[PDB]
Specification:
10 strands, mechanosensation, 3 chains, Piezo-type mechanosensitive ion channel component 1, 3-stranded antiparallel sheet, Piezo1 complex, part of a larger assembly, alpha+beta, membrane protein, about 180 residues
Chain lengths: ~180, ~50, ~40
């Protein structure tokens, strides 16, 4: 409440919910399982990122599962925030380098992780517009890093891969992505 | 039926169902697929 | 039981893993977990 002071908007929206009606999802970033990409598909992905022409997408879908024992007619709600990575733009030009398996390099993608998500009784988990006017600039920035582990004449697809995402502004919580989700 | 003799309980519950209404799941144990754990997470699991 | 298979300086995470579960009292049916399920 006190971090949205200027705003009567918070009174209209946030106040509707008892503090226990709202939960947080401390989803970890490191514990993603091993990537599953077939080296033909990995090479083709690298090609499309390197010398691609058509504009590419990168989506980020959440999904909440509730309990039917408490009544209710819907069980799954979900939506996506599609983002476009322009050809020859910085974002793709860095993802492509990331794929070559360099040890420490990393990239950050802006406006990808909304923080406050409403989960009403309909299959639309629409982001709450009313804690975030821009609907596209108020989204957090996420930091993607391709951790890479050797096993053992290809130097690229010879060994393990997985992805780790962190918030842009991580203080000591690199293993943390808070995501406040609203339940009616 | 005969392996729950002492029990009227079986009469109340089991009898409600025709023998075909009840099925068994011969789930195998060996044919689990390869584990998926990232060696950071495996090491952290081992630590915990 | 953690069955473990080698592929190929870590000796731990260098190679394949998977899990196999059996009943405590298995006679010859180590590849079997019966589970009687009731349907109304």
């Amino acid at each position: 409440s006190q971090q949205f002071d200027p705003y009567p908007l918070a009174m209209q929206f946030i106040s509707q919910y008892s503090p226990e009606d709202i939960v947080t999802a401390q989803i970890e970033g490191s514990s993603g399982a091993l990537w599953r990409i077939s080296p033909p598909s990995r090479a083709q992905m690298k090609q499309e990122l390197y010398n691609g022409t058509a504009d590419i997408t990168l989506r980020f879908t959440w999904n909440f599962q509730r309990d039917l024992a408490k009544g209710g007619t819907v069980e799954y709600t979900n939506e996506k925030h599609t983002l476009e990575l322009a050809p020859n733009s910085t974002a793709r030009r860095q993802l492509a380098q990331l794929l070559e398996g360099r040890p420490d390099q990393s990239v950050v993608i802006p406006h990808l992780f909304p923080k406050y998500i409403r989960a009403p009784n309909g299959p639309e988990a629409n982001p709450v517009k009313q804690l975030q006017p821009d609907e596209e600039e108020d989204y957090l920035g996420v930091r993607i890093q391709l951790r890479r582990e050797q096993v053992g004449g290809t130097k690229a697809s010879d060994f393990l891969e997985w992805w780790v995402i962190e918030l842009q502004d991580c203080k000591a919580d690199c293993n943390l992505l808070p995501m406040v989700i609203f339940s009616d």
